[PDB]
Amino acid sequence: KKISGGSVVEMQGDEMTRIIWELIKEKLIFPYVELDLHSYDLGIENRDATNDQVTKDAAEAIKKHNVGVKCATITPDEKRVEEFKLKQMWKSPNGTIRNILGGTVFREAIICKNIPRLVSGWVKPIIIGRHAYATDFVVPGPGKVEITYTPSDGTQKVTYLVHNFEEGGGVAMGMYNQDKSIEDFAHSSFQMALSKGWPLYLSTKNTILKKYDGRFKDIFQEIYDKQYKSQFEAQKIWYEHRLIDDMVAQAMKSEGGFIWACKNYYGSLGMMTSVLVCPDGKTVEAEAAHGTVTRHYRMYQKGQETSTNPIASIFAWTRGLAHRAKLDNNKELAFFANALEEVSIETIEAGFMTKDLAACIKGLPNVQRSDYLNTFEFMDKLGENLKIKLAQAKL
Amino acid sequence: KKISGGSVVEMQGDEMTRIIWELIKEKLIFPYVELDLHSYDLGIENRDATNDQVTKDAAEAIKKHNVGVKCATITPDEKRVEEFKLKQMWKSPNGTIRNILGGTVFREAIICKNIPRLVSGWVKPIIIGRHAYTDFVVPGPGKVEITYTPSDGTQKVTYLVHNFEEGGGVAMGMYNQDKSIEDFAHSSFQMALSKGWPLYLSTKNTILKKYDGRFKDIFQEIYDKQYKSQFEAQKIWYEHRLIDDMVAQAMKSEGGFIWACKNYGMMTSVLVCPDGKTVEAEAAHGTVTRHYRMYQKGQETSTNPIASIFAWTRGLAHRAKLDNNKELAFFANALEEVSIETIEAGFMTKDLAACIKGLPNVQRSDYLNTFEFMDKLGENLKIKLAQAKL
Numbered sequence A: 001k002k003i004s005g006g007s008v009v010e011m012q013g014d015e016m017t018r019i020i021w022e023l024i025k026e027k028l029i030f031p032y033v034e035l036d037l038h039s040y041d042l043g044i045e046n047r048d049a050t051n052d053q054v055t056k057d058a059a060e061a062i063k064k065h066n067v068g069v070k071c072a073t074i075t076p077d078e079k080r081v082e083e084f085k086l087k088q089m090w091k092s093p094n095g096t097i098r099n100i101l102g103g104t105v106f107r108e109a110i111i112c113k114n115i116p117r118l119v120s121g122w123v124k125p126i127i128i129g130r131h132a133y134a135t136d137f138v139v140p141g142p143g144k145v146e147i148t149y150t151p152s153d154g155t156q157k158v159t160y161l162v163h164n165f166e167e168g169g170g171v172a173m174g175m176y177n178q179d180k181s182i183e184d185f186a187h188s189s190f191q192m193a194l195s196k197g198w199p200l201y202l203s204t205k206n207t208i209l210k211k212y213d214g215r216f217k218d219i220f221q222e223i224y225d226k227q228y229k230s231q232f233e234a235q236k237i238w239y240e241h242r243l244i245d246d247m248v249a250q251a252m253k254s255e256g257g258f259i260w261a262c263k264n265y266y267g268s269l270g271m272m273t274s275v276l277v278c279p280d281g282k283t284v285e286a287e288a289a290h291g292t293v294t295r296h297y298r299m300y301q302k303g304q305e306t307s308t309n310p311i312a313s314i315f316a317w318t319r320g321l322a323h324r325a326k327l328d329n330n331k332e333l334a335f336f337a338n339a340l341e342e343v344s345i346e347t348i349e350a351g352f353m354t355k356d357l358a359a360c361i362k363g364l365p366n367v368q369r370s371d372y373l374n375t376f377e378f379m380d381k382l383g384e385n386l387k388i389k390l391a392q393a394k395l
Numbered sequence B: 001k002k003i004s005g006g007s008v009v010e011m012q013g014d015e016m017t018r019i020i021w022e023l024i025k026e027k028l029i030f031p032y033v034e035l036d037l038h039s040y041d042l043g044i045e046n047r048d049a050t051n052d053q054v055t056k057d058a059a060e061a062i063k064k065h066n067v068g069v070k071c072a073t074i075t076p077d078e079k080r081v082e083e084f085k086l087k088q089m090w091k092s093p094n095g096t097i098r099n100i101l102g103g104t105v106f107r108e109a110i111i112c113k114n115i116p117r118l119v120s121g122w123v124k125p126i127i128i129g130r131h132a133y134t135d136f137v138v139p140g141p142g143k144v145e146i147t148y149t150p151s152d153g154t155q156k157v158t159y160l161v162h163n164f165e166e167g168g169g170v171a172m173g174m175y176n177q178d179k180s181i182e183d184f185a186h187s188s189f190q191m192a193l194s195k196g197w198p199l200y201l202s203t204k205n206t207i208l209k210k211y212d213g214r215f216k217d218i219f220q221e222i223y224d225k226q227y228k229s230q231f232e233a234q235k236i237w238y239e240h241r242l243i244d245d246m247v248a249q250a251m252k253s254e255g256g257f258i259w260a261c262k263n264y265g266m267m268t269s270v271l272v273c274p275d276g277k278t279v280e281a282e283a284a285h286g287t288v289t290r291h292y293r294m295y296q297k298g299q300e301t302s303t304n305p306i307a308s309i310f311a312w313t314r315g316l317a318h319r320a321k322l323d324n325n326k327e328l329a330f331f332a333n334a335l336e337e338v339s340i341e342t343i344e345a346g347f348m349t350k351d352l353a354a355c356i357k358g359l360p361n362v363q364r365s366d367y368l369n370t371f372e373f374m375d376k377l378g379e380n381l382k383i384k385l386a387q388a389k390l
C-alpha cells in the first residue's frame, strides 16, 4: 500500500549532510513512498570523476521533471583542492543549477512554539525572497559625472547629472535591471504565494527611487491585475505593495504566514529552506540553507557522538514532494508531506530535540546530555512517531 | 560629595521614554553624579511652539560641549498632526541633529547570559556601523553609459553600463565622495579606540573592484599613516575581510569587535563624529506609545529602561574619556554592570521574561513593573558603589 510519488530528481550531497540524506531516504521517505527517482551523486569525488558533468545532467533532469531535491555540497577552495586532489577548482553546483534553471530563491524558516525567535508573536513562518541575477569607476579629481541613454531608434539622448565633483574626487557607479528579469521575479513571487496559499507583500523604498522602484511596483501591479487577481481572490489571499519603513513596522506586529518579496538594492542554524522557484511556476528546486556540517563530519570520522539537525534537510524533501503532489494532483502524497512536517515539528515541541536546538532553551554551556539526543536517536524517534502518525491517519 | 561629571547636553523626549528618562535622572544619575547639564525639551509640544528651533539649538550645544544624550522623540505623520494639532509636520529630530553634526552611527547590543542570543557563541557584544547617506526608466532598446568629464581639461572617460537588448527596463547612477569615506574611516577607528576592540572592515570588493577597492584603500592608508601605533599600543588590530569570509569568522567568535560594513529594547545608537570628540548617544527604540497609552489609562506598565540607561552610560563614559575622569568612567561602567547583573539575577521586565519563560507562560511573579525595576536598580547601584569604596 505504498504511495506513488512520481518523478522526483534527487541529489546526494557531501559529508554529514550526505549521511543524514541517506538516513532520511532509508527511514522516512522510502518505507512509505515509492518514487520514479532520478538519482544524481553530487559528491565531490563523483563531481571530480565526471568533470562536473553530473551537475549539468542533474540540472537538465530538473528542467525536464520540474521537481528537484538537493543535499548540501561543498564549494571548492584552495585547501579543498589539496584535500581531495581535485583536477581543478570546480564552480559551485548550486550556482550551475541556478544558472541553468533560473528563478527566485525564497527562504522559509521552520518555527516551533518552544523555540525562541525574534518578535515572538510570529506563530506562522515567513517567506522572504530577494531579486538577483553593476559598473563602477574611480573619479580621480574634480569633474562632472553624468549618465546618458541613447535610444537605438534615433529619438534623443537623455543626460542626467549624477553628481558634480567640485573639491576632491571619489568614486561612481551605475547599475541596471531589465524588464524581463522583473517580470520573471513577479511571476515567481505570485506562483510561490499561490503554492503556499499566503498573501504577498512587495516591499520597496519607492520614495527615494521614484522611477526605479516605481517601475518595480508598476510591473508587479500590471501582472497581478492581468492574470493572478482572480486566483488570489478565489483563495482569499491578496497582494499589497508597501514601503520598506512601513513594511517592517507592519510585519513586527502582524501574525506571519506571508510572502515578503523585497528588493536587493546567513542564519545557518539548520532551521531554514532555500526553495528556488522558476518563473513558469512548475519547476522547483528545494534544498537546506545550512552547509555540509564539516565539524560534525570530522567527529563522525573519529567515531565521536554527533548531534546534527536534520529538520532543514527533511523540509527540503517535504517541499519538493508537496510540489510534485500539487503538479500530479496526488492527495495522498500531499498528505504525506504535511504529515512529515507535522511529525518533525511535534517531535521538537515534545522535548525531543538535538543539541543545537536545546542550546537555545537551556543555554549553550548549561546543555546537559539528558536534554538532547544524538543524530541517530533523533532520526529513530522521528521514524517511530511518523509510523504512529500514518497508522492513526488510516481512519 | 557627588562625582564631578562635567558638561553634558541632555535632550528630553516624549511619552513613556520621557517618563523613564526622568526616572533615570532622578534615581540613578543625579544622586551620585553632579553635572553641568544643558537641558533641551525635544517634546512634540515644545518642538511645535519653537518651530523646531530647539532641535537646532540642541545640535549646536552638542557641537559645543562634545557630549549629547537623547531620549526617544516622535517623528510627525498624518495621525500625529491631527492628534496634536501641529502647525506643520516637522522633519525627524534625529535627521536634523545628524545633518548638523555629521558622523557615523554605531549600533551596540546589550548582552545578558540568561537572555537568548541570535548566535550561541556570542558572549561579548559586537558593534555594527554602516555607511549611510540618480535613477531613470529606459523606455526601449538603446545604450546606457556613464561619463566623467574632468574639470582640469583632460579627456572625458565613458563607461558602458548596458546596451539594452530587445525590451527596455530601468537604470541608475550612484556616487560617493572621498571626504565621506575619510570621515567614516576616522569615526570607525576612533570608535574602536574608545571601546578598546579590534576593527574589521567587511565588503564584497570582488564584484566592486574599483568602488569597494577604494574603501579598502582609504581605510588601509589612514590606519597605516596615523592609527597604527595607537592600535598596536593597545593590542588592537584592523583587518579587512570579504563579506563571505567575515560572516564565517564572526559566527565562530565570542564577539567583542567593531564591525564596519558598507551598506551594499536592547540596542544603543551612538553617533560618532569624525573629529573623535563629539558623540551623541541614544536608545535604538521608539517612544513606546503602546505603554504610554496604558499609563494614561491607569494600567500597570512594564517598560525596559536598559537602552535608555545605556545611552546615559555611553555619553558619561565619553565625557570621562575627554576630561580624563577616572571616577566618572568607573561610575558609568558600574551602572552598566548593575543593570546587567540585575537582569541576570532574575529581576527583569515582562518583555525580557517573555524570552526565558515563553511569552504565554509568563506570570506576574516572574516580572516587575517599570517602577519596581527602577527601585531595584537604584538599590543595587547604591550597594555597588558602597562596595566599590574599598
Ligand SMILES: Cc1ccc2c(c1C)N(C(=O)Nc1ccc(C(C)(C)C)cc1)Cc1cccnc1N2
Residues within 6 Å of the ligand: A107, A108, A109, A111, A117, A118, A122, A124, A125, A126, A127, A128, A248, A267
Ligand atoms: C532569511 C529568513 C527567512 C525567514 C525568516 C527569517 C529569515 C532571516 N527570520 C526573520 O526573523 N526574518 C526577519 C524579519 C525581520 C527582520 C528585521 C529585524 C530586519 C525587521 C529581520 C529578519 C527568522 C524567522 C524567525 C521567526 C519567524 N520567521 C522567521 N523567518
Ligand SMILES: Cc1ccc2c(c1C)N(C(=O)Nc1ccc(C(C)(C)C)cc1)Cc1cccnc1N2
Residues within 6 Å of the ligand: A266, A267, B107, B108, B109, B111, B117, B118, B119, B122, B124, B125, B126, B127, B128, B247, B250, B251, B255
Ligand atoms: C544592529 C545590531 C548591532 C549589534 C548586534 C546586533 C544587531 C542586530 N545583533 C545581532 O545579532 N547582529 C548580527 C550580526 C550579524 C549576523 C550574521 C552572522 C548573520 C551576519 C547576525 C546578527 C544582536 C547581538 C546579539 C549578540 C551579540 N551581539 C549582537 N550585536
